[PDB]
């Protein structure tokens, strides 16, 4: 996940096309961050050495 | 169990610049977030703007963008506002109080769980 | 500003029910509701948890819900210890707090 509420914002530029950006982060600070089970890794790893 | 201090008495004209500083006692300053809050006499409570104590960064109210600034300062583990630009209309009780654990993976901030609270002061403008 | 009954009356063993509504952005879309009670000439209280859940050694009496965009606290008997003003807050627009006037609980 990446938790912090953003926001996003566009300029045009120049005729048609328009170009997007990161408008603000209403406050708080992120971590970009993946969590998994320990227990299931371990098991995997060991039979994966067993084989 | 945890106990703030508060600031004393504070007699001022319109135009006051206050500052007003919240001291725990009891746990670290840098663990839990920092809420102010309003209540004048009559109406209900009204939630100033909150602190995070690890980098300083704060939100305040809307009505607020301009009037009230908010700094922290961890040597000693206290927080300070400043009121600038106050009038009359704006004698009210203000409230210190604890609010929810800064973590490094989720947003804590807005919740409203207020745990403990100060013994409030009151200011005087007039 | 968390629309709420300023008063509600009843006689003691009376269960009443003190409600909040707002909008549907602010209360409907997350349940992060608190109730706090300021006994008259103290300071606030604090009473109710998460939207319906209480804090270390709190009493059972008191309870809640969300109904739609609006919730209540749920009240058992009164009696007269309970006469006080009543507060609540709720999750607010992006990043704030948004809290109620009060309910000044009269007990008949
Ligand atoms: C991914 O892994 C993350 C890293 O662990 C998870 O973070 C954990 O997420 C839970 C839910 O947000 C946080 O829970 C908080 O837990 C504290 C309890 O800790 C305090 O009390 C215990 C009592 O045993 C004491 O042992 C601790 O030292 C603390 O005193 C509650 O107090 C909170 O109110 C809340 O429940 C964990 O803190 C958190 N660990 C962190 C922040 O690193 C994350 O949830 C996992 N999944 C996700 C969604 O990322």
Same mark, same amino acid.
């Given at each position: 996940?990446?938790?912090?509420?953003?926001?996003?914002?566009?300029?045009?530029?120049?005729?048609?096309?328009?170009?997007?950006?990161?408008?603000?982060?209403?406050?708080?600070?992120?971590?970009?961050?993946?969590?998994?089970?320990?227990?299931?890794?371990?098991?995997?790893?060991?039979?994966?050495?067993?084989? | 169990?945890?106990?703030?201090?508060? !600031?004393?008495?504070?007699?001022?004209?319109?135009?006051?610049?206050?500052?007003? !500083?919240?001291?725990?006692?009891?746990?670290?300053?840098?663990?839990?977030?920092?809420?102010?809050?309003?209540?004048?006499?009559?109406?209900?409570?009204?939630?100033?703007?909150?602190?995070?104590?690890?980098?300083?960064?704060?939100?305040?109210?809307?009505?607020?963008?301009?009037?009230?600034?908010?700094?922290?300062?961890?040597?000693?583990?206290?927080?300070?506002?400043?009121?600038?630009?106050?009038?009359?209309?704006?004698?009210?009780?203000?409230?210190?109080?604890?609010?929810?654990?800064? !973590?490094?993976?989720?947003? !804590?901030?807005?919740?409203?769980?207020?745990?403990?609270?100060?013994?409030?002061?009151?200011?005087?403008?007039? | 500003?968390?629309?709420?009954?300023?008063?509600?009356?009843?006689?003691?063993?009376?269960?009443?029910?003190?409600?909040?509504?707002?909008?549907?952005?602010?209360?409907?879309?997350?349940?992060?509701?608190?109730?706090?009670?300021?006994?008259?000439?103290?300071?606030?209280?604090?009473?109710?948890?998460?939207?319906?859940?209480?804090?270390?050694?709190?009493?059972?009496?008191?309870?809640?819900?969300?109904?739609?965009?609006?919730?209540?606290?749920?009240?058992?008997?009164?009696?007269?210890?309970?006469?006080?003003?009543?507060?609540?807050?709720?999750?607010?627009?992006?990043?704030?707090?948004?809290?109620?006037?009060?309910?000044?609980?009269?007990?008949?």
């Amino acid at each position: 996940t990446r938790p912090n509420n953003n926001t996003r914002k566009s300029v045009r530029i120049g005729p048609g096309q328009t170009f997007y950006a990161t408008g603000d982060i209403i406050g708080d600070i992120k971590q970009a961050h993946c969590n998994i089970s320990e227990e299931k890794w371990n098991d995997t790893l060991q039979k994966v050495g067993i084989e | 169990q945890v106990q703030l201090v508060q !600031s004393g008495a504070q007699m001022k004209n319109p135009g006051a610049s206050v500052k007003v !500083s919240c001291a725990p006692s009891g746990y670290t300053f840098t663990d839990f977030y920092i809420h102010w809050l309003r209540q004048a006499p009559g109406q209900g409570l009204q939630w100033m703007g909150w602190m995070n104590p690890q980098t300083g960064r704060t939100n305040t109210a809307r009505n607020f963008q301009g009037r009230v600034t908010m700094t922290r300062d961890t040597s000693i583990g206290t927080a300070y506002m400043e009121l600038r630009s106050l009038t009359s209309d704006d004698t009210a009780i203000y409230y210190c109080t604890t609010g929810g654990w800064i !973590s490094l993976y989720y947003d !804590s901030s807005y919740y409203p769980n207020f745990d403990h609270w100060g013994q409030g002061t009151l200011l005087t403008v007039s | 500003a968390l629309t709420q009954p300023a008063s509600v009356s009843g006689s003691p063993g009376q269960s009443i029910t003190i409600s909040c509504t707002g909008t549907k952005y602010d209360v409907g879309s997350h349940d992060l509701v608190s109730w706090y009670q300021q006994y008259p000439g103290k300071v606030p209280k604090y009473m109710i948890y998460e939207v319906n859940k209480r804090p270390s050694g709190v009493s059972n009496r008191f309870s809640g819900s969300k109904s739609g965009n609006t919730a209540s606290l749920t009240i058992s008997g009164l009696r007269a210890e309970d006469e006080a003003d009543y507060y609540c807050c709720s999750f607010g627009g992006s990043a704030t707090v948004v809290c109620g006037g009060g309910t000044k609980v009269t007990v008949l």
